[PDB]
Structures are given as C-alpha cells and as structure tokens.
Amino acid sequence: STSQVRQNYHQDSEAAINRQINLELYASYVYLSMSYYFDRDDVALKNFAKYFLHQSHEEREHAEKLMKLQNQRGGRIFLQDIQKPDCDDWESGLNAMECALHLEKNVNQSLLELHKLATDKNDPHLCDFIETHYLNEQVKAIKELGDHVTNLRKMGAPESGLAEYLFDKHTLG
Amino acid sequence: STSQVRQNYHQDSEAAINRQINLELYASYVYLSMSYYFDRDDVALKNFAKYFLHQSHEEREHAEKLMKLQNQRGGRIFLQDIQKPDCDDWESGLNAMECALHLEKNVNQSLLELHKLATDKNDPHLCDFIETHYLNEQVKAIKELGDHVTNLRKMGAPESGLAEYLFDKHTLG
Amino acid sequence: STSQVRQNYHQDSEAAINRQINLELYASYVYLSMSYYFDRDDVALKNFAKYFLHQSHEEREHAEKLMKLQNQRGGRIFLQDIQKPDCDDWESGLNAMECALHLEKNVNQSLLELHKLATDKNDPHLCDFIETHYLNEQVKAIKELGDHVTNLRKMGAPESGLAEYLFDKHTLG
Amino acid sequence: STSQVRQNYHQDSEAAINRQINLELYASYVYLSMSYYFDRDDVALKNFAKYFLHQSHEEREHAEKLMKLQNQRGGRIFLQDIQKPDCDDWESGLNAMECALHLEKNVNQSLLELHKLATDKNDPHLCDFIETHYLNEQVKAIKELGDHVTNLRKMGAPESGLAEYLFDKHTLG
Amino acid sequence: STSQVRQNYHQDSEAAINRQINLELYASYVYLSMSYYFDRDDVALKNFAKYFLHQSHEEREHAEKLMKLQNQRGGRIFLQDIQKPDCDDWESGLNAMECALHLEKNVNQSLLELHKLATDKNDPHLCDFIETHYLNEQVKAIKELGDHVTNLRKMGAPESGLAEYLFDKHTLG
Amino acid sequence: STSQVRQNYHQDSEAAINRQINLELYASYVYLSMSYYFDRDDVALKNFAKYFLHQSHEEREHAEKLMKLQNQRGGRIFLQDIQKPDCDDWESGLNAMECALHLEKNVNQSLLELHKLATDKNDPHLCDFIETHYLNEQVKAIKELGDHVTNLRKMGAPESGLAEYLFDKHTLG
Ligand SMILES: [Mg+2]
Ligand SMILES: [Mg+2]
Ligand SMILES: [Mg+2]
Ligand code: NA
Ligand code: NA
Ligand code: NA
Ligand code: NA
Ligand code: NA
Ligand code: NA
Questions:
Q1: Given B143, B163, B170, which is nearest F41 (Cβ)?
Q2: Consecutive H or E run containing C168
Q3: Which of D98, D108, D9, D94 is nearest to D62 (CA)?
Q4: CA of E159, closest CA in chain D: separation in Å?
Q5: What reaction gets catalysed by this protein (chains A, B, C, D, E, F)?
C-alpha cells in the first residue's frame, strides 16, 4: 500500500494537504463568482472582473501545485465537493474586496496550521514547501487586498459609484 | 428586477445555462482528477497527465464562456456545489479514456437538450451560441476520445503496460 | 421576372430584408445625429462624438451587408426614405446612451422577427446569415450600451457634468 | 440661445448649410442605390458597383464636413428625412453615369447658391470653406463623369453590352 | 454495430450524407469534363479551363469534408458509382456556365433537403455543419455563375467568339 | 472532324488513353475509400488515412495528365462512369496495403499494354510519354507498397494491432 517514494510523510500531513487542496479550489471558485458578478450589466466594472478572474486562476494554480506535492511525497489525492460561494451577489467592489481579504486570511490561517503540523511531524521538506510557495504569497495577497480596501473606503466606496469607477480605472486597470 | 439588456431570454433558458455551467465545472474537475491520477508515482504516464490537465483547463474555459453568455443576455449566474468525481483511482489509461468519452457524451447530451429548449423558446441567438461554440467541439472531442480508446484497445490496453507506455509516448506525447 | 440565381427565397423574406435595410440606415442616421450633438461647442464631449460616429458607420456597414445579401439571393432592393431621428438635441451623454440602447433593442427585435420569418419559410441560409452576422452583434452592442448606462448612472450622470467628462475620458477615450 | 463661439454667422447661412447637409446625404443615398443596382446578378458590373459605392461614401464624408462646419460656427444642425432616390432600376452604366452627372451638377448649383449667400452676408470664412472643400471637388467630379459618359457613348453604350463590360474593366477597374 | 461515438445521428441523416457525397463527387467530375473541354485545341479558352478545374478540385474538397463529417458522427461511408457527366462537348463558354449554374442549384437543392431532414430529426450539429460549410458557399457560387452568365450574354456569347475570348481574358484571367 | 493538331495518333491509342483515364480515376476513388476507412473511429490510423488520401490525389493528377495528353495529340476525351471500389471495409492496414499493391500492379499492366499498343502503332511520342511519366512511377509505387506489406507482415499485422499502430507511427508518420 505504501508508495515506493514515500519517506517522512505523515498521514496527518497527507490529510491536511488534501484539505488545503479543497480550500484552494474553493477560493478559486469564490473568485470566479466575484469576477462574473462584476461582469453583470448592472455592475459593469470590467477591471474588477479581470482582477478576480486572475485571482481565480491563480488559486487553481495553487491547488494544482498542492496536488503535485501530494504525488511527489507519495500521498494520495482524495478530492471532495467544492462548495458554492457564500454569496451570489457581492454588492459592491468594496464588499468584494473585503470578502476577498477575509478569504485570503482564512486560507493563510489554514496554511499556518498546516505548517505547524508539518513542524510537529518533523517534515522539513513540507515546511519548506509551505514557506517557499504559499506563506509569502498569502502575506502579499493580504497586503494588496488591504491596500485596495483602504483606498476604496477613503475614496468613498461603496456609496460613491464614482469612487468604484475611478478605482476600477486607475488601480485595477 | 429585469435586466436592462434582457430580450428574448426565457427563464427556462437561464436555468438551463446555469445547469450547463455547473456541468462544465464538474467536467473540468473530473479531468483534473484524472490528470493527477496519471501523475502518481505508481502510474507515471506523464502525457496522459498532460492531456487530461489540458482538458480540465478547456472545460473551465467552456464554463466561463457560458457565464459570459449568461451576463450578456441579462440572466443571473447562480453557482452550485461542484460534485467530486465518481472515482479517485482511474485504474488505467484506457479506463480513463473510456470514462472521458462517457463524460463528453453526457455533456453533449446536455447541450443537445439545451439547444432543443432554445429552439422551443424561439431563441435563435442562444441556439447559434450553442451551435457555434459547443456542439462541434463536443463532436470533435468525442471522435478524438473514441479514436484513443480504439487505439489503446487494439494495442492491448489495459493489460499491456507496454501498450499504454507507447500510446503515452507516440499519440499523447 | 424571377432572378436566375433565386432559390428558396420567399417574397416575404425579400420584403422583410428591405425593411431591415431601411431600419439599419435609420439607425446609422440616428447615431450620426448623436455624434454631432456631442460635437457641439456647448456639449463638447469628443469621445462621445467619436463613439457615436463609429456606431453610425457600423450601422451603414450592416445595411450594405443586407443589400449584398438581397442581391446574392436574387431579391430586389427597394429603398425608402430614411426618417429623421426623433431628437435634434440628445440632452446628455446618459440620455444618448439610453436612446442608443433602446434603438439597438428595437433593431434586435426586428432581427428576431426576421429570423422567425426565415425559419417559418424554411430558409436556413437566411436564418444562418442573420445568426452569423447580426444576432450576436446585437447582443454585444446591447450589453456594451447597458454597461455604459450603468456606469454613467452610478457616476452621477446626467447631473454630474464631471461624471460625463470622466466617462468620456476614461471609458470612451 | 446664441452660441458662445458664434461670430459673423447669419441665420440664412445656417439654414442653407442644413439644406446642403441634407442634399449631400441624399446624394450619398443615390450613389448607394446605383452601386447595389450594379451588384445585381442580372447587371453584374462589379467596377461600376465599386465606383458608385466609393462615391456614396465620399458624399457622406462631405455631409459630415458640413456638419462639422455648422458646429464650428455655432449653428445648430437640424436633420430632415433623406428622400429615396428617383429610381430603383438605373437601366445601364451609361444611364447611371448620366444621372450621376445630373446629380453632381445639381449639388454644384446648390453650392454656388450657398457661396452667393455667404458673399451677400459678408461671411468670408464660409465663402472660403465652400471654395476650398467643395467647388473644385464638384468641378472635378463633373469633369470625370462627363468623360465617362463621353467614353461610354462613343463605345456604343448602352446597347453594346460589350461596351459597358470593357468600360467597367478598363476605366473603372 | 453502433459506433462508440454515435449520438443523435439518425439513419436517414447518414443515408442523406452518403447521397450528398456522391453528388459532390459527381459535380467534381462534371467540372473536370468542362475544364478539359476548354483545353481542347478547337476551343482553346485557357482561363475557362482553369476556372472549371478549380471548381472540380473544390467539389472534391466538399465531398471529402462530408466524408469526414460522416466518420465524426459515427456513420459509415458507402460509396457508389460516379456517373459520367451528361455531356462530352459543352458547346461554348456560355453553355458551360449555364450548365454549371444548373448544377450548383441542384446541389443547393439537395443541401436544402438535407438541412430540412436534419431539422426534422432534431440534429442541430448537422444543421449547423450544413449552414456553416455549404449553404453560403452555394449561394456565393450561384451568384458568381449567374454574374458570369449575365456578362457573357450581354457581351454576345456564344455567337461572339470575341465575346468569349475577352471574357476569358478579363474576368476569368 | 480531324483535329488540326493531330499527327501520328491512332484511333486505338486515343481509345486506350480514354480507358487509362478511367482506370486512373478509379484508382483515385479506391484510395479515397481506403483513406476514409482509416479515418473511422473504430480503426483510427491517421497516418494510413493520410497516406491513402495522398495516393488518391496523386492518382487524380495522373488522370488529369492523361487528359492533357489527349488534348495535346488532338484526341477527344470521352469520360465513363467511375465504378465504386470493390470494398467499403478494408479490414486492416495490411489488407489495404495488399489491395493497393494489387491495384498498382493492375494499373501498371494496363500501362504496359498501352505502351505495347503505342509501339505497334509507331507512336514514339506516346511511348515516351508513358515511359517518362508513368512506368517508373508505377515501379516505384509497387516497390514502396511491397516494402510496406513486408514490414507489416513481419511486425505481425493484421492480428497485432500494436504492429499496425507502430507502423502507422514510424513508417507512415
Ligand atoms: Mg447556425
Ligand atoms: Mg480589351
Ligand atoms: Mg516505438
Ligand atoms: Na491560494
Ligand atoms: Na465542455
Ligand atoms: Na445594425
Ligand atoms: Na458632395
Ligand atoms: Na459542392
Ligand atoms: Na496512377
């Protein structure tokens, strides 16, 4: 049953990786929802739509990298349902950015728990994988989203449709 | 409530489009599963993995095109859970190709029902969308998968691991 | 009297095509009016003017393509007066965009009736002509105009002359 | 009510410019009719069709230049119906060329009356606009059409279908 | 017996496709005959010969595309004899063009019946195949041949050997 | 009745050339059948299909060259029906190659009879035409097909579907 390649790879780490794969696919799907919300004719913020679609594809890439890791270490991928996002209507550019920030912080929390598990199981390869490919990406994503939220709020979003319009043009465009 | 852009777009068509979006995302996820099955160290068919990953990304593109359609017509996207694939272990290149063929024919059947609905609702734009972007794609995909299955079977898959090896190299590589 | 090329081309289809030619020329003339309204010294929205002039020329192209169709099928073009547009003064960028949206939806409705007639007369060539060259063009145009209207309204048009100014610059420029 | 830019621009000149705009659009529409007459399967003179389509587009350009003038001077464009051309069937290349010559001379006569009005109102800018952009264009167009008519008649048009064929090929092609 | 790829493909459609393949090969052979008629030393119209040879090859391409369709849908090609053309001696450029026009209209009629059958069997893929690849091609070909016939007749074909000579040079060359 | 160009061209040679034209068109049609047999989803040997399609087009070229010869010598082409091939289902790559070899040898036998006739009628131009353009082409084609048959048989065709697969890839691809 044990993979010929498997070495120093705990069952708990394998399970946590599978959970992280599901979470990344969930995040991708959330961003997809947000993108096409901004593509609606009654919202019509093209650069918001582009930004979130880019994020969706990036999240899928993260999931695929975790799957590659799983196979590299001799674990076995077990996929689960990808839950639909919490919202269909994201209300505003600002609200979407705040929800994205919340999502990214939740993903980061999951990654930090995964790193703690890897450290507890004395799996330095997994710890290094998480540090190298995920933790700084999360810190940067959170910083960027926080900057966006700050700018939108200062500009007067979401009540100032001019605010969101000009943010869409000048920051995201 | 009605979109300012909506014209000649039946509620049943909007609902059927949402169902098709979900089906396309499901197909993408199935192909993702197959790809990373072939990336396993105990299967190790790199070109199978590449082929199915390509299909996964293509299916995501199809879903995104349907979402774009939905917004173009003034319908509203409602996402649902993406169910996990039926298998975690796809057993063989031949078995994966047969399951892919079955999947593509099911997607094609859903598209045909969508076309019939569009026709019944006298929605020529939707009909020609389906025709132009999907139906021929499906016919081609089904033909390609059938060709693959025929070749694998004739070569002696799945019992001939040499068969699958050489198919991976010469057809998919 | 019958053209040597004519085949499967109903008199009702020929008449409907002539009506569509007139409607397209009318739309071209409406857009011409809007363009030069925005070129007025007391309006001075250069990119609105450019946008509507482009639309005017596009509508002329659509009319010419219908005339080419008419001759291809062996029907005979009968031109009628091109009525002057409903307005001389279009009041605002937002009002012009709303009137354009209304115009495009009326043209689309006429095209849909044309398609239904073609279908009823079992004229698949005409049906596919309409589908290929017109229906998607209309859907796209309606979506774009709806997006413009949404943005203008959210920005505060037509009372915010700053709104229209910045829309002219950043979207249409 | 008076435009901030308006200076030395008589109401009669503004009205005459509006009349000239309508006449130019009428001429464009006449040429459009002639072009697609020659595109008929039972006439089939491609280079006649091309020549008259070019003239149609040129006439629209002339109308647009007059509209630009109108706005530059602070007059207000008032569009009227564009009357359908006098003929649907132009009978022959020679007959179309003769009608075109007649049309161009009528347009030239209207321009001359416009110039006389400008002169009487001591509007040197308008006079020089007409002189610079229109009068020489008309003289050239009339000379070209007269040359065409002379050649066709000498060749034996309209009774010599060979005549029209070879003229189409060698002069207009 | 049923192809693994076959889906929504009626036996009547398969049979009609086989009939269309035969008709296209017949048309190719007719054009071949016409081409080499014009290559005769006592006819010597090189550009007629070239035109009809081009048409012959185009018709073969159409047949091959129908065969590809047949295999794509999982039908089975059944070839039949290709009947010899009705004439060995085509008498004149004009007569050949008229026979070509008649042939193209017959092929178009067969395609229209095929489309009607596809529609009746609710085969939107087949319908759109026919619409996309064939119907417009036929309309264009019929229009071109009608234009040629009109020109030849007006020039004085077939009694004016000068007529046919100059048509060969200037239109077909 | 006699062509102005005809010189030293026997009626028997003209008739034999017409027979050879028909035989070449027959061979082209046989190869077309074989090609699309290999394009079937249940055979799926793309390079076999390509090889035989190439042969089909080559055979058509041979027929056209014979027609050109016929006109060059002042004979008159008389076309006959092109009989359908003996098979619809060619069973295997090996069987198709063997049938192709048989076909090529039959064509060669016909060409040798034609050369004997030309020699008997003291027609050195025709003898040279046959020698230069046909006899070596036939010898090469027969040698190539024999080589293919030898390789397939040695590899284990037609029972080894791996054999045919790898031949398709490495020789014909
Ligand atoms: Mg269609
Ligand atoms: Mg000449
Ligand atoms: Mg090998
Ligand atoms: Na991520
Ligand atoms: Na798909
Ligand atoms: Na239009
Ligand atoms: Na003019
Ligand atoms: Na054809
Ligand atoms: Na040959």
A1: B143
A2: none
A3: D108
A4: 13
A5: 4 Fe(2+) + O2 + 4 H(+) = 4 Fe(3+) + 2 H2O
